[PDB]
Amino acid sequence: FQAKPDDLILATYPKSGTTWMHEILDMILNQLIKTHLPSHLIPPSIWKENCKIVYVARNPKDCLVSYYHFHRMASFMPDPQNLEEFYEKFMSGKVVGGSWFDHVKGWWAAKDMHRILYLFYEDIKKDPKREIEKILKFLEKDISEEILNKIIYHTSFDVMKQNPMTNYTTLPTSIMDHSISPFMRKGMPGDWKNYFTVAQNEEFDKDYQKKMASTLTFRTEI
Numbered sequence: 001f002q003a004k005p006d007d008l009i010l011a012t013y014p015k016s017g018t019t020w021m022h023e024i025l026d027m028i029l030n031q032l033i034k035t036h037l038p039s040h041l042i043p044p045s046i047w048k049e050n051c052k053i054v055y056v057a058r059n060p061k062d063c064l065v066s067y068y069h070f071h072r073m074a075s076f077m078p079d080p081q082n083l084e085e086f087y088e089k090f091m092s093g094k095v096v097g098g099s100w101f102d103h104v105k106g107w108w109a110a111k112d113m114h115r116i117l118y119l120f121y122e123d124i125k126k127d128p129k130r131e132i133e134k135i136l137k138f139l140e141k142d143i144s145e146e147i148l149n150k151i152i153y154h155t156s157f158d159v160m161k162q163n164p165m166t167n168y169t170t171l172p173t174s175i176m177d178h179s180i181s182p183f184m185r186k187g188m189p190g191d192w193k194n195y196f197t198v199a200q201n202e203e204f205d206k207d208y209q210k211k212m213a214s215t216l217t218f219r220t221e222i
């Protein structure tokens with residue numbers, strides 16, 4: 001894969017803000033390549049050319065829950081069975097895409113050597129103006145207040161949810177059935193609290209602490 005110096009790359013672990021951020025980057029730019037690869041598997045061409053990369057990470061509890069429901073509604077994805085069973089496989093990194101942990105850490109470290117803007121799903125929810133302003137400084141692109149507010153409006157969850165071009169409702173019920181769980185489900189940090197039992201959560205915090213020791217921190221609420 002021969003990369004071009006101007007190509008802009010969107011990199012996420014699944015269920016972390018791909019669709020959302022693709023839309024932000026889409027509008028700002030008016031070549032955008034997206035990938036779910038872990039840093040160690042990016043083609044070397046992309047580093048040598050010094051492509052700008054936007055990475056989006058999401059707190060792993062919401063990511064896990066989002067990934068569960070998505071499994072429920074996608075035909076091409078394995079049966080998740082239970083949130084309990086799913087948790088075990090998510091924490092093990094025995095899910096499509098592999099380990100969230102390795103993903104987010106590897107990209108976190110990669111930003112010491114490489115032109116990467118590393119953003120947080122939760123920071124984008126809390127203050128899209130602030131996050132989108134970093135993107136603009138990163139792309140050395142300059143945009144009117146009028147258009148910046150337009151982007152914030154256009155890429156808000158409520159608006160994207162009604163947008164056929166982005167909500168994945170232009171796919172047959174038999175590949176994604178939205179009656180089970182919409183692809184645009186809740187879009188809310190802290191939603192995981194409605195699904196983790198207190199005991200599931202204490203178990204998580206004990207595995208997470210071990211598996212992270214990463215100056216990477218997350219918000220699990222806003």
Ligand SMILES: Nc1ncnc2c1ncn2[C@@H]1O[C@H](COP(=O)(O)O)[C@@H](OP(=O)(O)O)[C@H]1O
Nearest residue numbers: 015016017018019020066156157184185186187
């Ligand atoms: N415009 C938006 N704002 C906030 N969250 C969004 C969004 N568009 C999609 N999402 C959320 O991002 C997740 C999908 O991520 P990806 O595009 O990488 O698969 C889903 O999470 P939830 O299932 O937790 O709501 C989806 O609702």
